[PDB]
């Protein structure tokens, strides 16, 4: 027997409602509820969330990012690159009708879709040194335009790159200009990347176009044991030590023929 999706021990789970992990982390405008969330015991995501990447594309190394989250219990968002910091590029025009916010065109909240300015796109050379004591999850992206005219209008420079460097990362990315079928009315694509910036390390960004720059990153402030549970249920005012993807169960009897994936890891199962 079971009830629904409940709370675990004394810590309540993070329940993503129609939003995916990617939409949450990138700041999909349709997921504003998850700005400054508290500690969680485990994370809940639906099988097919409606709000994933408002602007279509891909999240690089997404499965290993999920495995990382299975050992993270709390984030603390911080601003590493203020949007007002961009003086040679336009930072307030990268909005799309694919990313609506209350009817108006918007974009992912934690990253900035930079645009040329004064008919020029000078080379960006920005570095952020993690002076904090915690590990830092940093997110950025690249824009793959649909055609060469779009590349010209947005970034001027026809041949562009993005360079990202840490003590462990040596990444150089070139955009792939190619015509595509439309997704969310968009024929371009946004590809996002992530890395952990260790304390006292520095991430060095360099680009002459197509750069979706970071503004907010996440401090890792607690490293317990979490899971990304796939469930359609909802909170769920209750409490247990063992939880399943289809309901909750208190006390203990080795009877269990429902699901292997269970937070709390209290016996048993077929």
């Amino acid at each position, epitope marked *: 027997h079971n009830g629904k999706l409940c709370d675990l021990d004394g810590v309540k789970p993070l329940i993503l409602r129609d939003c995916s992990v990617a939409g949450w982390l990138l700041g999909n405008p349709m997921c504003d509820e998850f700005i400054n969330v508290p500690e969680w015991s485990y994370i809940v995501e639906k099988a097919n969330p409606v709000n994933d990447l408002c602007y279509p594309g891909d999240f690089n190394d997404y499965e290993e990012l999920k495995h990382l989250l299975s050992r993270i219990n709390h984030f603390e968002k911080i601003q590493i690159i203020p949007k007002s910091s961009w003086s040679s590029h336009e930072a307030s025009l990268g909005v799309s009708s694919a990313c609506p916010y209350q009817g108006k065109s918007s974009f992912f909240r934690n990253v900035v879709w930079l645009i*040329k300015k004064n*008919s020029t796109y000078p080379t960006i050379k920005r570095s952020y040194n993690n002076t904090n004591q915690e590990d830092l999850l940093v997110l950025w992206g690249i824009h793959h335009p649909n055609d060469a005219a779009e590349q010209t*209008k*947005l970034y001027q420079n026809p041949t562009t790159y993005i360079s990202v460097g840490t003590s462990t990362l040596n990444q150089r990315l070139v955009p792939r200009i190619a015509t595509r079928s439309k997704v969310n009315g968009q024929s371009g694509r946004m590809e996002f990347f992530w890395t952990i910036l260790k304390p006292n390390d520095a991430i060095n960004f360099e680009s002459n176009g197509n750069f979706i720059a970071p503004e907010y990153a996440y401090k890792i402030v607690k490293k317990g044991d979490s899971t990304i549970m796939k469930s359609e249920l909802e909170y769920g005012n209750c409490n247990t030590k063992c939880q399943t993807p289809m309901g909750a169960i208190n006390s203990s009897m080795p009877f269990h023929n429902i699901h292997p994936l269970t937070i709390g890891e209290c016996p048993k199962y077929v």
Partner: antibody
Amino acid sequence: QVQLQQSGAELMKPGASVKISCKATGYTFSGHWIEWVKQRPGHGLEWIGEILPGSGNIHYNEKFKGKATFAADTSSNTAYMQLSSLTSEDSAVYYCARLGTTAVERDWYFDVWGAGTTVTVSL
Amino acid sequence: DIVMTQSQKFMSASVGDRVSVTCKASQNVGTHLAWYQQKPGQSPKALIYSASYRYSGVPDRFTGSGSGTDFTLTISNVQSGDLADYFCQQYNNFPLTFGAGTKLEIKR
């Protein structure tokens, strides 16, 4: 709600220059590109170029690189086109127009046009 | 530069007829094409964008079709108010370019 108000007809001597204006109202002036177009009888429509007000981003049709100069005044919501070194072939109706989509979208169609400005170049 | 060719300089129609204006781009423009209507003494008006999307207020008897190089604007059930010039526009490449226009004249 969106209107484009163009300045009036002008008669110019050969070799002179003219500055025509386009006052936009009803929307965020800085979020849409302003197009400029040239229409002559017996000729197809010609694209002159493009300006995104407030950003300094300007595109010119190579055929008009020496003729046209764009500028935009965000406090006045007014876009300007200057035509220099006027010849007989510059006598035409000039339209300003707004792109229907916002600055970074891909559908560059002209949803709102001005009423046009007739330029006559003659001694 | 991409040349947009409207082979039909003129085109006749009775009220209620079905006419189609053709526009051939000299090279691929995908679906980055728009159609406009212009009556004498007036500024152009948007009809179609993205080859087949109807502009907001436009009646649904205006249909656009085609992709790549060959495009068509079809006016079904021609109405007296459709007396106008019609021209295409490609925005796949710089510079933007327009067709030379086709004049629709009503039969009588």
